[PDB]
Design a protein around this ligand. Sequence first.
Ligand SMILES: C[C@@H](c1cccc2c(-c3ccc(CS(C)(=O)=O)c(F)c3)c(C(=O)O)[nH]c12)N1C[C@@H](CNC(=N)N)OC1=O
Ligand SMILES: [Zn+2]
Ligand SMILES: [Zn+2]
Length: 230
Amino acid sequence: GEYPTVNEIPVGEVRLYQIADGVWSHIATQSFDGAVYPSNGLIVRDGDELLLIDTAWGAKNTAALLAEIEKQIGLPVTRAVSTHFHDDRVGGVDVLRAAGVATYASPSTRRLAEAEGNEIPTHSLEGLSSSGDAVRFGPVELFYPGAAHSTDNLVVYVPSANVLYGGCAVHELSSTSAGNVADADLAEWPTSVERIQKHYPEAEVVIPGHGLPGGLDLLQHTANVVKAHK
Ligand SMILES: C[C@@H](c1cccc2c(-c3ccc(CS(C)(=O)=O)c(F)c3)c(C(=O)O)[nH]c12)N1C[C@@H](CNC(=N)N)OC1=O
Ligand SMILES: [Zn+2]
Ligand SMILES: [Zn+2]
């Protein structure tokens, strides 16, 4: 019943966690440069179908994700959105595409994934190229807050449940640094978080890209750790 943690999930297994009615997170673990990390995604019920947000960080993890969804939920995943171009978001897109899932990302994410050799979602999401832009996508709103963890990062809001999925632009409360900043804009990140805070003041649950969900405090904590990292 507790939120599944990095040392509790072997690499290759996936667990789901019920966030709200018709909203789950998915949690998996992966090795990278000789360390093991957890990572989150989202699942949102879309009538008798499911919308997936982000892969489970790798092909085998993402196959295991689809199997876990079939076991725990039993509705088909028909569409997926990747919230930026890194492997914890797009690694597994080829698995999804071979399982009948239509895969989407912004044009900026698709360009970055292609240039860096990561898997590439099929469909481009227009209407998200300027910070503050928002578009509807099934049961969610997609929001581009500006550059933060990456220049292309998107956040996702579930209006029926007031769930804010921050992706990797948002860190968990226990975080001590800004995570993997390889592609980050540390100077712009606080401004982008402020845009999230201003656009989603009624969020009740905030889910980071890695680690434990909480409330709105994750946003301020993120700004604090990024400012101090910088
Ligand atoms: C795939 C992804 C990646 C790989 C490994 C780790 C991360 C973490 C991380 C680390 C640490 C923490 C804990 S904490 C907050 O600092 O206390 C965390 F919570 C998230 C994050 C994140 O922060 O989102 N992402 C990671 N990758 C590749 C990559 C390309 N690297 C290049 N050199 N090109 O960039 C990147 O992010
Ligand atoms: Zn990333
Ligand atoms: Zn990440």
